[PDB]
Structure 1
Amino acid sequence: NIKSAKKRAIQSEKARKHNASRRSMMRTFIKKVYAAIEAGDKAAAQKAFNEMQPIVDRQAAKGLIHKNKAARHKANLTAQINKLA
C-alpha cells in the first residue's frame, strides 16, 4: 500500500523465486541420496552424497538453509548408507 517500500514487496518476491529454485534443486539432490539408500545401492548412495554434500554446505553459507541444517543431512545420510551399505 502506497508507501515507499511497496518496493520491498517487489524485492521480497525477487528473493522468493531465487530461493524457491535452489531450495528445490537442493532437496532434489538430497532425494537422489535417499533413493539409492532405499534401493540398496551403496555406491550410487555415496555418489549422491558426495554431490549433495557440496551443495548443502554451499547453500548454508549463502544462507537459505543455515549451518546446522546442513550438518544433520550429512549426518543422517552418512549413518544410513553404512548401515548395510
Structure 2
Amino acid sequence: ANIKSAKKRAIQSEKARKHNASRRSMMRTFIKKVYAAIEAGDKAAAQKAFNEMQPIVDRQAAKGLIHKNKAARHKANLTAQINKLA
C-alpha cells in the first residue's frame, strides 16, 4: 500500500477478518449440531440445541456479522424441520 490510510486499513482489515471469522466459525457449529440432531432423531436434545443456537445468531445479526433476514431464515427453516420431525 502506498498511502498511510491504506496501510492502516490493511492491518485493521486483517484484525477484522480474524475476529469476524472467529464468530462465524463458532456460529456455524451450533447450526451443524442442530442439523446432526435432525437425523439423530432426538426430541429433547434437538430443541435444546435450537434454544442454545437461536440467541447466538441474534448477536451476530445485531452487530451485522450476518444479516437479520439470514438469521431469520436459519431459525425459521430449522424450527420448521424440528416441528416436522418431533
Shift of 1:4: 3.1
Paired residues, number = 85
Answering whether residue 9 of structure 2 is matched by residue 8 of structure 1, we say yes
**C-alpha RMSD over aligned residues:** 1.1
> What is the TM-score with the length of structure 1 in the denominator?
0.93
> What is the TM-score with the length of structure 2 in the denominator?
0.92
The percentage of counterpart residues that share the same residue type is: 100
Q: 1:5 is paired with a residue of what secondary structure?
A: helix
- Runs of 4+ more than 6 Å apart: none
Shift of 1:5: 2.1
Answer 1 or 2: which has greater helix percent. Answer: 2
Q: Tell me how far apart the structure 1 counterparts of residues 70 and 49 of structure 2 sit (CA, whole Å).
A: 18
Match of 2:61 in 1: 60
Deviations, residues 32-63 of structure 1 (Å, cap 9, x unaligned): 11111111012111000001000011110011
